Design a protein around this ligand. Structure first.
Ligand SMILES: COc1ccc2c(c[n+](C)c3c4cc5c(cc4ccc23)OCO5)c1OC
Length: 575
């Protein structure tokens, strides 16, 4: 028999092969950093110094023959291609007419972006996240933000994944006009310039490749030489742990929506839809696409953009075209892909899209039932209420009234029910709507008791400016505080108020607040009671479920209340 092959581990690159080439100690254009191959190129060097070498080799993975080739004297390189990622026990055999001889087995890894080579992620979840047996039809969604791994120190293994059906990964940018990104300051706009070098306008890219796939997380077992790292390798291992979890990239958002306004031109839609197909073929752990255009018709971050006439039909065409592309991917892969969108729910946002036409292409609409009031001006109100608060004026809720100056309201007030009823009345199916919950507050200072027109209600006061605070308090920008900051600095464990704050609840609106009458600090947020109200409301109307922005800001209380308020319910999943 031939001499048994002896595998050269070092010069077969210790048997780590990857279908994706990712650039590692550099930051460059997306097309220079990311290259995906349908088949991994496997090159394994072996030698046979004593004896006869034979004529032909065979390579086996877990005892099944996967490749064959010619022996070349004393040193051969087995070269072949392989599609399926995984961990395999490889042996190499040399054969001639006298017989065959095989190497010792050795583990080969073929990395792919579905995480087929990875073990289930080890989790490190705050134990205040409790266990529920919510029916699997109900959507329990949240957004995980790519930048949460920095100051916020919240990583994929912190997510309470057994309590989630859908994770929206925020946010994938679109190359092109992106002036709005400069409003976040820092290196965000420059990082996008770098990512888009050599990329066509209106194609998707990864905004921060360090966070997405370069950074080594010791809790995930990453080493500096591991071929896929970052949040994306953790999401691939999370999918190995929880295979029914849907992980969806969210394209756009408040700061990254400026390129959508050029989708009035079909050529730019076609460039975008092709780039998304290519993205989902590259990053196989993703299960569809979420489009967060804020907003058709304008009123987002770009004051100079928005076309009430033309953006709606462009959004509908985009959805049509994306569902054609996703059906191509379902035919190619045999998988199911979801198409979703987060939308504004103010009447002036909903009137700009004919949702009765768009929703036929969509699996779910994530209704952004939050940010109704905030520190952008000095008018207090409930940022995430279901219904109209006691602070509002006669006829403000339905929009038939006049304001304090006698001027007509232009539409119904910003509440979750006004927006959900406007979507339902035009024929959007309840079972496609997912109601949003806020894991943060918005706030003001300067709301002192003398400014209140009703002394029992701080929402009738007037502010002097935004809430101010530090990042240890969960204030990452003025006017916005993490829920877990409100719990540590304003509520306390018994929910009865600390540090000079008092708790109140508008039982008509279904909306909580904390108020420090000394400083005039007032914060509008969601809490256990108001999230139980939203789940009861979702069960009453047959909505798909609930989602939240953003998971790093919860301490478990808000996701627990999302499950508690949906207990017992089931829903028909959209077809
Ligand atoms: C990226 O995170 C976010 C998420 C939502 C917002 C935001 C910034 N601004 C100014 C607003 C905002 C600003 C408004 C407004 C309404 C608004 C509603 C939502 C956001 O009325 C007029 O001024 C933001 O930060 C850049």
């Amino acid at each position: 028999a031939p001499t048994a092959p002896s595998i050269d581990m070092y010069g077969s690159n210790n048997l780590q092969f990857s279908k994706i080439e990712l650039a590692m100690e550099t930051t460059s254009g997306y097309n220079d950093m990311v290259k995906y191959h349908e088949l991994a190129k496997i090159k394994v060097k072996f030698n046979q110094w004593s004896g006869t070498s034979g004529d032909t080799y065979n390579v086996y993975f877990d005892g099944v023959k996967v490749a064959t080739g010619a022996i070349t004297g004393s040193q051969t390189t087995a070269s072949f291609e392989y599609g399926q990622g995984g961990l395999y026990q490889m042996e190499i055999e040399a054969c001639d007419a006298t017989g065959c001889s095989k190497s010792a087995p050795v583990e080969i890894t073929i990395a792919d972006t579905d995480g087929s080579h990875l073990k289930p992620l080890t989790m490190n979840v705050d134990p205040n996240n409790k266990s529920y047996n919510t029916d699997p039809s109900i959507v329990m969604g949240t957004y995980f933000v790519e930048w949460g791994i920095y100051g916020r120190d919240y990583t994929v293994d912190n997510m309470p994944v057994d309590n989630l059906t859908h994770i929206l990964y925020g946010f994938i940018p679109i190359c092109g006009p992106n002036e709005s990104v400069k409003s976040v300051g820092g290196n965000s706009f420059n990082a996008l310039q770098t990512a888009c070098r050599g990329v066509n306008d209106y194609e998707v890219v990864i905004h921060d490749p360090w966070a997405a796939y370069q950074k080594s997380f010791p809790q995930a077992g990453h080493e500096y030489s591991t071929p896929i790292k970052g949040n994306y390798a953790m999401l691939m291992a999370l999918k190995q742990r929880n295979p029914d979890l849907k992980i969806i990239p969210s394209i756009g958002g408040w700061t990254l929506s400026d390129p959508f306004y050029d989708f009035v031109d079909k050529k730019n839609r076609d460039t975008f839809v092709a780039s998304v197909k290519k993205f989902l073929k590259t990053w196989k752990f993703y299960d569809g696409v979420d489009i967060d255009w804020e907003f058709p018709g304008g009123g987002g971050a770009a004051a100079d953009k928005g076309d009430p006439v033309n953006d709606g039909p462009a959004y509908i065409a985009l959805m049509r075209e994306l569902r054609v592309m996703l059906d191509e991917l379902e035919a190619e892969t045999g998988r199911t892909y979801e198409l979703t969108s987060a939308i504004g729910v103010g009447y002036d946002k909903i009137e700009d899209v004919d949702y009765a036409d768009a929703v036929q292409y969509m699996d779910y609409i994530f209704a952004m039932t939050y940010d109704f009031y905030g520190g952008w001006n000095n008018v207090p109100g409930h940022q995430t209420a279901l219904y109209c608060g006691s602070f509002m004026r006669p006829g403000q809720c339905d929009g038939g009234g006049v304001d304090e100056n006698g001027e007509p309201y232009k539409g119904p007030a910003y509440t979750a029910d006004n927006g959900i009823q406007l979507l339902l009345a035009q024929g959007v199916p309840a079972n496609k709507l997912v109601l949003g919950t806020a894991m943060y507050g918005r706030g003001w200072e300067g709301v002192t008791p003398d400014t209140l027109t009703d002394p029992n209600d701080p929402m009738t006061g007037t502010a002097t400016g935004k809430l101010k605070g530090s990042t240890a308090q969960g204030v990452w920008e003025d006017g916005v505080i993490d829920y877990k900051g409100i719990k540590s600095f304003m509520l306390g464990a018994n929910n009865t108020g600390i540090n000079g704050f008092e708790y109140g609840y508008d039982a008509q609106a279904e909306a909580p607040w904390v108020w420090n009458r000394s400083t005039g600090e007032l914060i509008t947020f969601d809490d256990h009671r108001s999230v139980l109200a939203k789940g009861n409301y979702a069960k009453s109307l047959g909505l798909a479920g609930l989602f939240s922005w953003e998971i790093d800001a919860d301490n478990g209380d808000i996701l627990n209340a999302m499950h508690e308020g949906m207990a017992g319910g089931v829903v028909t999943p959209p077809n």
